């Protein structure tokens, strides 16, 4: 009730009509790839051709992501049940790219359901310029949620 008219009615109608709330301007977590569609569409006046170059420029990248291989996973020291369970993965075609992600084993329904669709995260790339390793053995660890 800080500011009032029209602002109050929107408290319901911005939930009660989902078509008002749906737009491409989502809360996007997919920043590692969704920017690679837009930077080709980043043009002031354009034509029907430009989209095909933009689409294929994303679709080349997409298949490498779908071929990522999981190498290791960090269990919560010695604990089990409701773990975040971090995993590390890489590209097979060359050992150049490394990534990590996680899952929410607590997020479920009890009525013979399992982990809920949102209960899994998305890959983040690793920035540090590694060049030598003990034969692909790179180890992730958790330091009180660092």
């Amino acid at each position: 009730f800080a500011n009032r008219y029209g602002y109050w009615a929107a408290n319901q109608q911005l939930r009660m009509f989902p078509e008002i709330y749906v737009d491409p301007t989502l809360r996007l977590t997919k920043t590692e790839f969704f920017f690679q569609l837009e930077s080709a569409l980043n043009q002031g006046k354009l034509t029907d051709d430009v989209a095909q170059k933009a689409v294929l420029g994303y679709l080349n990248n997409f298949e490498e992501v779908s071929n990522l291989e999981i190498i290791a996973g960090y269990q919560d020291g010695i604990d089990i049940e409701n773990d975040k369970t971090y995993f590390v993965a890489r590209t097979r075609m060359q050992p150049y790219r490394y990534f990590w992600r996680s899952l929410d084993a607590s997020q479920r329904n009890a009525n013979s359901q399992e982990l809920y669709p949102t209960a899994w995260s998305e890959w983040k790339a690793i920035s540090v310029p590694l060049e030598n390793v003990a034969n692909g053995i790179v180890r992730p660890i958790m330091m009180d949620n660092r």
């Binding site: 911005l14 939930r15 989902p18 078509e19 709330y21 749906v22 491409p24 809360r27 997919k30 790839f33 969704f34 569609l37 837009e38 569409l41 006046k45 354009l46 034509t47 029907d48 989209a51 095909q52 933009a54 689409v55 994303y58 679709l59 997409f62 298949e63 992501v65 779908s66 071929n67 990522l68 291989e69 999981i70 996973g73 269990q75 010695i78 089990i80 049940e81 409701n82 899952l103 084993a105 607590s106 997020q107 479920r108 329904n109 009890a110 013979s112 359901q113 399992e114 982990l115 809920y116 669709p117 949102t118 209960a119 899994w120 998305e122």
Partner: protein, 209 residues
């Protein structure tokens, strides 16, 4: 101390799961999936055309599971990987149509919206595509939903905007019904009478939806 079979696994790479009565709250069985073969199904079809990727018959392609003791009779939208199907089968089709709608490219925006929905065709080639969707041509607009349960306790429009496909597909209809009118007015403004009045051939289709 204690140990568990959270371990390496046979040829389909999915890792071992340590307990049948579950490592967690409910008895999900000693089974999981991780990776997918989808690129080996896609590379051919996608190098042939985009128009084959935005075919419901392509979207229903097979995988395999026999190493864990099941069968993967189609590409399944499983939460550990499922977003990459949606990103490819909806969002790339959408943003082009969104740009083109604005930039006076109305019939080009229509040529992209025709990968989602087709209120103009009743005579497609596959008998199963004639039968099942029937008007909708990206399958995650129709394929298996459930509940929306485990986001209810903090519930918001950020949850409800993707609880189910029906209101999401009725939003595609709201974008489409605008796109006819957005072009019709460009025939009515600044032209001469027998061209201005031609806009009624658009308003008479919009008023049929």
């Amino acid at each position: 101390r204690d140990k568990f079979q959270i371990k390496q696994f046979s040829q389909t790479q999915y890792l071992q799961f340590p307990e049948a009565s579950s490592a967690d709250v409910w008895y999900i069985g000693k089974q999981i999936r991780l990776n997918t073969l989808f690129a080996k199904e896609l590379i051919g079809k996608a190098s042939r055309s985009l128009d084959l990727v935005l075919s419901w018959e392509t979207q229903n392609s097979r995988l395999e599971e026999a190493i864990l003791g099941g069968a993967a009779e189609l590409i399944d939208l499983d939460g550990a990987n499922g977003i990459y199907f949606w990103e490819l089968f909806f969002h790339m089709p959408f943003m082009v149509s969104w740009r083109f709608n604005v930039e006076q490219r109305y019939e080009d925006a229509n040529r992209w919206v025709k990968y989602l929905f087709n209120p103009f065709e009743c005579e497609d080639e596959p008998a199963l595509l004639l039968g099942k969707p029937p008007y909708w041509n990206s399958r995650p607009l129709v394929d298996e939903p459930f509940k929306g349960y485990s986001l209810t306790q903090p519930s918001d429009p950020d949850a409800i905007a993707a609880s189910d496909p029906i209101h999401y597909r009725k939003a595609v209809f709201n974008f489409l019904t605008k796109n006819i009118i957005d072009q019709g007015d460009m025939e009515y403004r600044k032209l001469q009478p027998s061209a201005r009045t031609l806009a009624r051939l658009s308003y008479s289709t919009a008023s049929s939806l």
